[PDB]
Subunit: 215 residues, 4 copies
Amino acid sequence: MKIDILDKGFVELVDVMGNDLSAVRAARVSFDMDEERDRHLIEYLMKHGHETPFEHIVFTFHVKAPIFVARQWFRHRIASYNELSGRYSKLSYEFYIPSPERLEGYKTTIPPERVTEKISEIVDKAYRTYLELIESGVPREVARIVLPLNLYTRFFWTVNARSLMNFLNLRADSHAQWEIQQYALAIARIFKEKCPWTFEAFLKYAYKGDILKEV
Amino acid sequence: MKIDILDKGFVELVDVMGNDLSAVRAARVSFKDEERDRHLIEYLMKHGHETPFEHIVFTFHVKAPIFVARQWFRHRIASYNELSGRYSKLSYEFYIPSPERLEGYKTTIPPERVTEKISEIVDKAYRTYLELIESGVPREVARIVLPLNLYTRFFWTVNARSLMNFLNLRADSHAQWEIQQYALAIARIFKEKCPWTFEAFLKYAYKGDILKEVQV
Amino acid sequence: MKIDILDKGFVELVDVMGNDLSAVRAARVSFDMGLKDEERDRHLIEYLMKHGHETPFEHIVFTFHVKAPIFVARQWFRHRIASYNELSGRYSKLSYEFYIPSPERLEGYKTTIPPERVTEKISEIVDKAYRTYLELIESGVPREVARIVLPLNLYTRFFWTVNARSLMNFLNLRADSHAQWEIQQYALAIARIFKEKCPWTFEAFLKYAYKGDILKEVQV
Amino acid sequence: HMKIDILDKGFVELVDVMGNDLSAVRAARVSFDMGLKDEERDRHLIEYLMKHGHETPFEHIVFTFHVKAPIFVARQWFRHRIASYNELSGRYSKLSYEFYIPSPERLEGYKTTIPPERVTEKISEIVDKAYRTYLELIESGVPREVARIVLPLNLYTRFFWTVNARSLMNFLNLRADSHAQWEIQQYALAIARIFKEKCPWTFEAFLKYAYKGDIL
Ligand SMILES: Cc1cc2nc3c(=O)[nH]c(=O)nc-3n(C[C@H](O)[C@H](O)[C@H](O)COP(=O)(O)OP(=O)(O)OC[C@H]3O[C@@H](n4cnc5c(N)ncnc54)[C@H](O)[C@@H]3O)c2cc1C
Ligand SMILES: Cc1cc2nc3c(=O)[nH]c(=O)nc-3n(C[C@H](O)[C@H](O)[C@H](O)COP(=O)(O)OP(=O)(O)OC[C@H]3O[C@@H](n4cnc5c(N)ncnc54)[C@H](O)[C@@H]3O)c2cc1C
Ligand SMILES: Cc1cc2nc3c(=O)[nH]c(=O)nc-3n(C[C@H](O)[C@H](O)[C@H](O)COP(=O)(O)OP(=O)(O)OC[C@H]3O[C@@H](n4cnc5c(N)ncnc54)[C@H](O)[C@@H]3O)c2cc1C
Ligand SMILES: Cc1cc2nc3c(=O)[nH]c(=O)nc-3n(C[C@H](O)[C@H](O)[C@H](O)COP(=O)(O)OP(=O)(O)OC[C@H]3O[C@@H](n4cnc5c(N)ncnc54)[C@H](O)[C@@H]3O)c2cc1C
Ligand SMILES: O=c1[nH]c(=O)n([C@H]2C[C@H](O)[C@@H](COP(=O)(O)O)O2)cc1F
Ligand SMILES: O=c1[nH]c(=O)n([C@H]2C[C@H](O)[C@@H](COP(=O)(O)O)O2)cc1F
Ligand SMILES: O=c1[nH]c(=O)n([C@H]2C[C@H](O)[C@@H](COP(=O)(O)O)O2)cc1F
Ligand SMILES: O=c1[nH]c(=O)n([C@H]2C[C@H](O)[C@@H](COP(=O)(O)O)O2)cc1F
């Protein structure tokens, strides 16, 4: 399961442990204890704020996104990450170039297409400088500091359903930067596919964002 | 995989995400070569690069005495869900030390006596507990008379990194003998599911003193 | 500040880092700003609270000294985003101190025997249990084993260091009617101390983020 | 309060502190139902805790730092999850013209084609070009959050960092080390200096029995 994001990014499901019943199983071991009663249990937990059971469902995603997006994403501390190193490996000539539509709703002094060019220009100059420095003998960890924030990076993300729902509340929301919103929509999609009951209950009683209830 | 512990407890594997290769894929950030992948696991462990192992996750079902659970629950980097003494009626299941548990201490009374002394207050406490309930006393208040050796059950979801920290601390002679027994069981299961990580752990990071002397 | 809880327990403030302004300074770095005036700053706290910007409050930290029954501590210790250090039954000779519910504790439930009867039967188990505990020790039984006969109402002690964000989550969950009465009582004391040290944050918390019920009916 | 300048335009500034060495002693002492004692026994306890890996007591010592560092350094720093952060926003505020320009010495031990002076020149140039484009887009009507994506990783950012002594020591083990990038090493050294100043005993014990790095 893979979903393309932005111009060169993506979100792909690597692994998953459990499903909706994993939360039911965990929670049930509380009352010292059926598709109908179990699904209702999930609604009950979601409705009353008992989310610890959902921590027993875990996902591992492989993500490709611009650094400025990853910086916001990595602020979510209740999760595990492993990302490509700009000091250990040579960075690929891959940058996020906003589409003209990105600026829609904004009256700019110059046509959107021009903005696209300006950004692509800097990217090109920075990357060339980067390559020159390396070939010149400068260590990679130093050379890459001239590279712009829209440079793509990749990382593995392991997170449980509870932290994932917090992520969606904050990132699958109009207040979050559009770019990460797009990734969050992808995460939600995959989450829905693997845990329909939990996702359904989440949207109905806990989800605090706005966009998931309109897309 | 279900292993009996003490007189009435157990450790059961409920689920697991990944295997040794999960740590390898995460470290490389990719997606093949047994020799190279195994080498990487050792490399990561030897140099303290522990984060890749967080991508391996386990869910256990555990039955243990509350005094053991209290120590176990001090490990904050994990998820727990346990039976409630205020929501359900507690079963008559208590941990009675084996006659050999005190074999090594200068005791004045015979092992059978200790067993009888413990079994005695246990029976009295539970009887009192049931009495209060039947009398209308809320469960949450009635259970306060129950001894710390009462058995409880919980689900534990933890990643390999935090699990290794648990083994360093609990699979060790300094920890209470009772939790050591559980830690040995967790270690066996870990070893079965992640042989490479487990071996590299014992070889380069394990800080305890029993897993190196004991088998699996 | 040392508030008595239940019959022998307590909550005491050991230390604190920062105050309402600590959260303001933290939040301001976002817009490349610092403090302003007490009017604008207090407005920010309220603003942060109502919009779900919780991280700034993580910069306010408290350390409490708590004495409570083990069954209460077990619930308390489930809050993982905090630090704890507790008295050890493996390393220390536990003293004779147990939580004996007051007669009023059962007020509201139609029981068979008198509230005073429940009291005596609880104290009975306690005495017999502690009795056996000392005997086992006197007999050479190591403390870590001897204590397993002790009941859950035995009092324990611990230090608790937690930041304002986690503390608010604690209050949402424990200063609430769904939590056991015993820990509710402790949560009220935590709230009282919180209110005194961070009045702006506290007030903003009750009006905008607090999800519990009792703090809106009870004072401080 | 303390402030140490790092790199060409950065700094590490102590904002607040909760507790001191004795805070760890008090927290630890509760285990034996005890409290503070003399200076000789208390300091000895700290070394004891450190030696045997009993680290929880140190979690009761907390610091709040105010840091100004380039983004590439901050990204590594923010990987330390057991802490609290609040940082300057590129989508909410106009970013200032401050970039980390390596000094000629930075390339020490590295023989490069073009003179180090030239490396400095080239870095400043791309930096200048990117920033001007940034302002151009901003005055052009482009949202701050979009315009800033052309800015390089050596752009200076600012943030508040609240961390307890236990996590701080893990930070030093990893960042106050030759394996970590030189730039963050410099920040780590300033962090250690402040730590030492505020918690002499803890720091001394840490360096003698727990510190895993190689530059302190
Ligand atoms: C619209 C928007 C604007 C933002 N603007 C800024 C900004 O200007 N500056 C900035 O620095 N950040 C900003 N952020 C990032 C924000 O401050 C959080 O870091 C981010 O949302 C990650 O959330 P989290 O802390 O809830 O999650 P996680 O770090 O993944 O934590 C999940 C849960 O565990 C918790 N938790 C984890 N660790 C701790 C701890 N140490 N103490 C107490 N509770 C803890 C909380 O209950 C939390 O919700 C913004 C986010 C959004 C969505
Ligand atoms: C032999 C033995 C004796 C003990 N005696 C006592 C006693 O007398 N009193 C007592 O209260 N406890 C005692 N403990 C419990 C001990 O203090 C820890 O709570 C327990 O080992 C759990 O370990 P942990 O903190 O490493 O693990 P986890 O809580 O699972 O944490 C794992 C890792 O994340 C970290 N971490 C998590 N949270 C934080 C945080 N908030 N700040 C900084 N780092 C963090 C550290 O790197 C840690 O190793 C004892 C344990 C053992 C094994
Ligand atoms: C009325 C009531 C009834 C309860 N009944 C039961 C029961 O029957 N069985 C039982 O076992 N427990 C029960 N509990 C305990 C409950 O499951 C939680 O452990 C307790 O409320 C502590 O809350 P917390 O997880 O939100 O807080 P903390 O552990 O302090 O965590 C604070 C925040 O960080 C988060 N967080 C921390 N760690 C993780 C993680 N690993 N993954 C994802 N997010 C994380 C979340 O955003 C969280 O709210 C009950 C609690 C209450 C108040
Ligand atoms: C020389 C060097 C090279 C590096 N190279 C890379 C690289 O190529 N790619 C990359 O992505 N990162 C890299 N890193 C970052 C590294 O992977 C860690 O993210 C960083 O050191 C932060 O450390 P930490 O996890 O120990 O600390 P914190 O996140 O602050 O955690 C402190 C303690 O709590 C723990 N803990 C916290 N959360 C969890 C959890 N969810 N599960 C289990 N235990 C937990 C552990 O005991 C840990 O030591 C590198 C770091 C160094 C020093
Ligand atoms: O929407 C946001 N999301 C986020 O996670 N940050 C955190 C990410 C980074 O650590 C710092 C600066 O972010 P940015 O420049 O994207 O605003 O604050 C800020 C925002 F505005
Ligand atoms: O070996 C131990 N393991 C442990 O986790 N504690 C923590 C558990 C509990 O929160 C408190 C007291 O534990 P105990 O009475 O078992 O010593 O400290 C203490 C020990 F001695
Ligand atoms: O109100 C509660 N609060 C709580 O923290 N638990 C957690 C505490 C313990 O780990 C386990 C059983 O608790 P208890 O017997 O008190 O119900 O679940 C349970 C409740 F019902
Ligand atoms: O020394 C390092 N420290 C660090 O924290 N990372 C993490 C930071 C970032 O999230 C990603 C890429 O870092 P960098 O490009 O600096 O190598 O991995 C990587 C290193 F090599």
